[PDB]
Amino acid sequence: HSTAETTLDSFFSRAGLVGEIDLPLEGTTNPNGYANWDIDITGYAQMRRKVELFTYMRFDAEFTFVACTPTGQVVPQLLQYMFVPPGAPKPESRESLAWQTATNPSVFVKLTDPPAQVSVPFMSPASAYQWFYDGYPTFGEHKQEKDLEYGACPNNMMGTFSVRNVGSSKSKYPLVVRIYMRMKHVRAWIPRPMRNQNYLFKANPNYAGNSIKPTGTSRTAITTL
Amino acid sequence: HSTAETTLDSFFSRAGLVGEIDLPLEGTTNPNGYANWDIDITGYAQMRRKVELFTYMRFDAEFTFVACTPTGQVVPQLLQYMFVPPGAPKPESRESLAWQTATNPSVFVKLTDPPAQVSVPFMSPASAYQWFYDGYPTFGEHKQEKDLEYGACPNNMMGTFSVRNVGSSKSKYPLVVRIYMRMKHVRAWIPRPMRNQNYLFKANPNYAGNSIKPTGTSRTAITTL
Amino acid sequence: GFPTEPKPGTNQFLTTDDGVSAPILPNFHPTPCIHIPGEVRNLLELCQVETILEVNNVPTNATSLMERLRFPVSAQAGKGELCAVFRADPGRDGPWQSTMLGQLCGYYTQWSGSLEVTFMFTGSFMATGKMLIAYTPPGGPLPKDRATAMLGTHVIWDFGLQSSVTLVIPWISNTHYRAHARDGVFDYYTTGLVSIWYQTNYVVPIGAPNTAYIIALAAAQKNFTMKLCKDTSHILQTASIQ
Amino acid sequence: GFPTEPKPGTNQFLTTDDGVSAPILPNFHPTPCIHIPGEVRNLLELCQVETILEVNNVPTNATSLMERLRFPVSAQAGKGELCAVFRADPGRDGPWQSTMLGQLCGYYTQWSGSLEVTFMFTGSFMATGKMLIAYTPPGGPLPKDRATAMLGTHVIWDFGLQSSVTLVIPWISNTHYRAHARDGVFDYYTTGLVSIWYQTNYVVPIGAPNTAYIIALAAAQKNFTMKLCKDTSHILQTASIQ
Amino acid sequence: GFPTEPKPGTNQFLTTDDGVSAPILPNFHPTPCIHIPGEVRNLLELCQV
Amino acid sequence: DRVAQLTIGNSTITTQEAANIIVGYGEWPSYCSDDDATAVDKPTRPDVSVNRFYTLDTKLWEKSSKGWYWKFPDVLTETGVFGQNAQFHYLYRSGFCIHVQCNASKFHQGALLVAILPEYVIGTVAGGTGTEDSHPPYKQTQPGADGFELQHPYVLDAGIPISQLTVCPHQWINLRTNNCATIIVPYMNTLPFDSALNHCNFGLLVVPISPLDFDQGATPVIPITITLAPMCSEFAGLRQAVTQ
Amino acid sequence: DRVAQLTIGNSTITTQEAANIIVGYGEWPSYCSDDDATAVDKPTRPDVSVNRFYTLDTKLWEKSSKGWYWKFPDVLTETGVFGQNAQFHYLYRSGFCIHVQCNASKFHQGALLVAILPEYVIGTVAGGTGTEDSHPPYKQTQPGADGFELQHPYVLDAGIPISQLTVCPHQWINLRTNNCATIIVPYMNTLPFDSALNHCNFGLLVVPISPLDFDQGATPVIPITITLAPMCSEFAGLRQAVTQ
């Protein structure tokens, strides 16, 4: 019996949803034809629980962007995706000058074309990404107001992902962009207990203290099935 | 730690905006369905500042033409791009005879096709392009009226880039063509101080004498951060 | 151009397809990889590490959760009384859910191999006793008494300097692999039952506690294997994670 | 034709993608390349050339811009007085912005390596003096006095025939690379502080100027490296360039 | 089919592009070339007259 | 094999009821390679003055104790010459030899799980309901030498099962078998050096899995003492002493 | 190493307080290769009559001086036999040995930056506001032997920082150290030959970075003299003498 399907690559090299961006016509969520998604794969439970089985992880990845309207309808619209590394100017509008991408990598696709796919390397200044960082990013007094920074490691903050309608006028259709990630060439260190409770937030392991459920199923008596 | 990302090719081999052509329906800017862009990568600050770090530069390039309407909308329109080397007849209208391209290189694309891309060699009669030419192109008296020619080197004037609606009637849509340039096989000589002030014009290093700002940030005292 | 002919499957996005994708950063070079302790190469490395088996999965009270981690043993009446019972099924709802093995199983449809359960006696040094841990292969109903349980695979455990004993649940199956066993039809893949009985009795002097606890730790053997990845039965999330 | 299947990324225009493009001029042959002096092969060649460091980045007046290029030194009271101070951070707003190194850094997200600052005394031949240039690694607040500054990396400079002295700011970091340091969270990547103190005093005879200036020149060492290209923080343009 | 990705310049007709084109007459063989006086190989031959 | 002696620096530990020695992740502490390093300044390797056994506070094991934990670089930052170097230098690096000791009698019983959990991040109960994004105070994330007591050991105060804590370098103290646990930990981090003040490489957990018990008359005070020694300590980036 | 002598042609320069010699871009002047050339006519290589030291005007260093510059092919076009050849021939090519000299006393102080800036294009203040596209007059772009004074040295009258001017072949004259600067420049241009009248290959900049200073009583007149010698001069394309 082969042990090949339990290698790290077999386990993690499967694309899963990690991001979802909305570009509606009318609303309070990115209604100006552009959006800035903070790159963080910690927003969805399935993908998150798997990677959080290990403390550190080094890997290249393959990102696929599936775009369409909220009904799943494919529309003849041209979009522009741009990777904005930390420090680069984040677009403030659909006609922002930042869309010139003289140096940032950008992808131009129509929703009628098959989902855009691209390869990304391991771009952390650390030797691996940390799903858990037990510490603070800066020195000084750590008062109540700044406890927001506990567990925040900049070595995991890879930047922003920006999207827009390639134009100067409002789009004729409402859009949605789902982001999938497939890990390749994976190295992993230090396994940990698997998530036990429901996830509540992105930057931390908070759990609902009043709804602490058992790891699994329960029964009436220990002497009866 | 590798020193590969600081080679000239790594630094310059990144496409950036160097030209922008408008083909509106009604207006005073190329309203007859055609345009003649004078090939000069000195019209945009980002790309210009980088190359002006060196005095001389020899390189091949890859030009990409991204076309669409002013709203970013992709329209079913057929365009014709033509490279008109200096000396060749520049088109005077959409139906000009020059569009026969019996010898000039031309590209026919629809806005629905992916952006046209093409390779260009080093076509200067000099051994390299000069971002700076401290002299005049012709002999004779150099009076006030002709100071317009100071710093103008013909070895950098590669010709014109012409665009048109492949037709004999007005187009049904307003168009815009953005030109991107990626340098390849780069050689560079004699580094210079990097642009300090805002750019004002193309053919020269003029700066606003009343708004001469410091190279960088300032502070209150030299003994305090 | 070169004559081609696209086939079905064109444009589809298969989650598990392992293909090539355009790189976003040309000539980018990753931070060198330092040496880090505890590198994992295969998940089976984790399935062999013993983790506490919640045999006493009865208390659900808020304050009594820590006591599912161990079960009691005490002075009896000497008639081979039953101590505890549990299914040997790894990927089934029950005691094994508290173990790393049980958790990793949740990610695979099928498994194969022998399992092992180590019982550690945490009574006092003066406490003595002999237990009979028995494993009843499939088909055998929960043994009604010790005389019935002893007819299957078992081990008589004697408390002493060596605090623990290991019950090996040998791989005794009809099929090469077992899918996760559930109530109903899939009970076809049941592994069997484990039951602890008093071989003799928990004996103690005056001055020593009349009740002690046992902690069960479970893991897999070297011949354990898993195949066909799937998602765990549970998703730890109710509403969007903020 | 040959069965193909386009993947995501199709038709996209990635600014940094290094691919092939159709040539516009068939059989075209470029003008031969003559030999030209001063050819550059790598930008690191420029990071090692010293350029004037504006330590005295105080004057903003129109007529006083040329005096940011040098700072004063003069006869004191002999109590180890402070002369000047500045952050050693290369890609941070401040004195280093006037240097070629600081400018090239602006084009890269991260850097690594030792830096060096050479101080040239431009007083008169008859002027004497000893200074103490100190480098305070991260965490160390701006030293309040010389007795505190001397506890870090430093060099006692004696004015003489050799007009200059070099303070080497050794690469003392926790991380292999440093991203540009800014106020706030990214102050995590601060390099430290440099401070010039009077070791003894600026002494001079009658007839010689009581005030002289020092010019600081800065560059990188042979172990300096940069990675991850980005655009400089500033764009020298307000409106369209005509 | 084999994964491809068309780049800019697709469909354009460059007057001076030297590529391959489908032949209209399969197995066609041209009339043999007799020997003819005054053959030119390079235009520079004419610039010297 | 039941007896052992650990000598390092000018300190020696003895034991006659040990249970072998665990070497975390099968690796001994070592100094930083010339190719794994970045900081260019020459480090200080004080040796014998810092690589020795430091005995921190003692805890009392009660029939109702829940368990305690200690963050490691931390526990020593205010003790001996190790602490001074950790305060004066920006960068620190080192492994540890942890020896938890607790003895009773042949009539007492109970079992302690002594484990090492790298990057032991503490979570909060989130106001009970789970709607309040509260965070653990400095006093709890870095308790110092006095350690801190677990409020919800079942989930290690971090939402993870203690039943799986054995995938980490651990050892048990079963009173009927041994009276101490010895674990040797190498330097583990994604960086060659790091701050001994802001970062805690791992946490030491001592938790009673099998409750302590005995009959009235037997001594009721059963202490648990923690002794630990740094190994291959290296410091760099000298400056003034910083407390935090 | 502090003393030196430069002999070329029938001229000799002496110095006892030098600071070595700089060879621009690590290359000595040389004649044009047979494969780098295009002009088919045989060039003139007058040698000793043109490759010698010419001493141009002297400038006075004041406590308030801003700095001066000289365009090079230019400074010599109206002097000696070099000038005659530069006027009679269309094409010119050559390197230069520049020796800037300025002495004071052990009681004076100050520092001059002597640098060579290839293709030194001059810009204007654009009418102050920056809305007027004005251009520098012939008198300023090609000042001749009298040189020209900088109005805004900080930006080298060309919008570029002088603080980075050291990426060019340079040398300093620090009165407490040396009293002269010697720089040898090879022929630099994108062409093998060019006009000595229309084009100026580079510019010589002499700028006070550290102000001159001294006490009243010490001689107040401190001159800065420029001496320069062509090297490997070649001329071609003979015709009548042309001044411009």
PDB file of N, CA and C in Angstrom, chain A residues 113-136:
ATOM      1  N   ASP A 113     -12.953  34.902 -20.746  1.00  0.00           N
ATOM      2  CA  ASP A 113     -11.758  34.077 -20.894  1.00  0.00           C
ATOM      3  C   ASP A 113     -11.723  33.116 -19.711  1.00  0.00           C
ATOM      4  N   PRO A 114     -11.024  31.978 -19.849  1.00  0.00           N
ATOM      5  CA  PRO A 114     -10.969  31.055 -18.712  1.00  0.00           C
ATOM      6  C   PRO A 114     -10.285  31.755 -17.532  1.00  0.00           C
ATOM      7  N   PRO A 115     -10.630  31.367 -16.296  1.00  0.00           N
ATOM      8  CA  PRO A 115     -10.022  32.000 -15.121  1.00  0.00           C
ATOM      9  C   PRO A 115      -8.515  32.218 -15.202  1.00  0.00           C
ATOM     10  N   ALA A 116      -8.073  33.420 -14.846  1.00  0.00           N
ATOM     11  CA  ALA A 116      -6.655  33.739 -14.863  1.00  0.00           C
ATOM     12  C   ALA A 116      -5.965  32.882 -13.816  1.00  0.00           C
ATOM     13  N   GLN A 117      -4.768  32.413 -14.136  1.00  0.00           N
ATOM     14  CA  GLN A 117      -3.996  31.577 -13.227  1.00  0.00           C
ATOM     15  C   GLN A 117      -2.564  32.081 -13.267  1.00  0.00           C
ATOM     16  N   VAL A 118      -1.896  32.058 -12.121  1.00  0.00           N
ATOM     17  CA  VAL A 118      -0.553  32.595 -12.065  1.00  0.00           C
ATOM     18  C   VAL A 118       0.277  31.918 -10.972  1.00  0.00           C
ATOM     19  N   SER A 119       1.599  31.897 -11.136  1.00  0.00           N
ATOM     20  CA  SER A 119       2.492  31.287 -10.146  1.00  0.00           C
ATOM     21  C   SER A 119       3.163  32.325  -9.263  1.00  0.00           C
ATOM     22  N   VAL A 120       3.171  32.052  -7.966  1.00  0.00           N
ATOM     23  CA  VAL A 120       3.764  32.949  -6.990  1.00  0.00           C
ATOM     24  C   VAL A 120       4.849  32.215  -6.210  1.00  0.00           C
ATOM     25  N   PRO A 121       5.984  32.879  -5.945  1.00  0.00           N
ATOM     26  CA  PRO A 121       7.070  32.242  -5.198  1.00  0.00           C
ATOM     27  C   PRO A 121       6.904  32.424  -3.697  1.00  0.00           C
ATOM     28  N   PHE A 122       7.903  31.989  -2.937  1.00  0.00           N
ATOM     29  CA  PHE A 122       7.867  32.158  -1.492  1.00  0.00           C
ATOM     30  C   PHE A 122       8.462  33.541  -1.258  1.00  0.00           C
ATOM     31  N   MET A 123       7.610  34.523  -0.990  1.00  0.00           N
ATOM     32  CA  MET A 123       8.089  35.890  -0.822  1.00  0.00           C
ATOM     33  C   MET A 123       8.146  36.493   0.564  1.00  0.00           C
ATOM     34  N   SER A 124       8.438  35.680   1.565  1.00  0.00           N
ATOM     35  CA  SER A 124       8.529  36.201   2.912  1.00  0.00           C
ATOM     36  C   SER A 124       9.975  36.524   3.234  1.00  0.00           C
ATOM     37  N   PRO A 125      10.209  37.531   4.090  1.00  0.00           N
ATOM     38  CA  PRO A 125      11.596  37.848   4.434  1.00  0.00           C
ATOM     39  C   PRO A 125      12.099  36.835   5.466  1.00  0.00           C
ATOM     40  N   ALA A 126      11.176  36.024   5.979  1.00  0.00           N
ATOM     41  CA  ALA A 126      11.512  34.977   6.942  1.00  0.00           C
ATOM     42  C   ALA A 126      11.758  33.713   6.120  1.00  0.00           C
ATOM     43  N   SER A 127      12.187  32.630   6.753  1.00  0.00           N
ATOM     44  CA  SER A 127      12.443  31.405   6.006  1.00  0.00           C
ATOM     45  C   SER A 127      11.175  30.597   5.787  1.00  0.00           C
ATOM     46  N   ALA A 128      10.080  31.050   6.386  1.00  0.00           N
ATOM     47  CA  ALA A 128       8.797  30.374   6.255  1.00  0.00           C
ATOM     48  C   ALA A 128       7.682  31.238   6.818  1.00  0.00           C
ATOM     49  N   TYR A 129       6.449  30.962   6.416  1.00  0.00           N
ATOM     50  CA  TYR A 129       5.310  31.715   6.922  1.00  0.00           C
ATOM     51  C   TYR A 129       4.936  31.123   8.281  1.00  0.00           C
ATOM     52  N   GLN A 130       4.371  31.942   9.162  1.00  0.00           N
ATOM     53  CA  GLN A 130       3.960  31.481  10.483  1.00  0.00           C
ATOM     54  C   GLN A 130       2.461  31.656  10.626  1.00  0.00           C
ATOM     55  N   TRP A 131       1.744  30.573  10.878  1.00  0.00           N
ATOM     56  CA  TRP A 131       0.307  30.688  11.060  1.00  0.00           C
ATOM     57  C   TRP A 131       0.074  31.176  12.481  1.00  0.00           C
ATOM     58  N   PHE A 132       1.126  31.093  13.296  1.00  0.00           N
ATOM     59  CA  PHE A 132       1.076  31.523  14.689  1.00  0.00           C
ATOM     60  C   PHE A 132       2.338  32.262  15.102  1.00  0.00           C
ATOM     61  N   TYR A 133       2.163  33.472  15.622  1.00  0.00           N
ATOM     62  CA  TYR A 133       3.283  34.290  16.076  1.00  0.00           C
ATOM     63  C   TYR A 133       2.977  34.740  17.496  1.00  0.00           C
ATOM     64  N   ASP A 134       3.591  34.092  18.475  1.00  0.00           N
ATOM     65  CA  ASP A 134       3.352  34.438  19.863  1.00  0.00           C
ATOM     66  C   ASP A 134       4.220  35.604  20.312  1.00  0.00           C
ATOM     67  N   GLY A 135       3.830  36.809  19.912  1.00  0.00           N
ATOM     68  CA  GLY A 135       4.582  37.988  20.289  1.00  0.00           C
ATOM     69  C   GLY A 135       4.017  39.252  19.667  1.00  0.00           C
ATOM     70  N   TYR A 136       4.723  40.364  19.851  1.00  0.00           N
ATOM     71  CA  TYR A 136       4.307  41.653  19.311  1.00  0.00           C
ATOM     72  C   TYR A 136       5.271  42.088  18.211  1.00  0.00           C
TER      73      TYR A 136
END
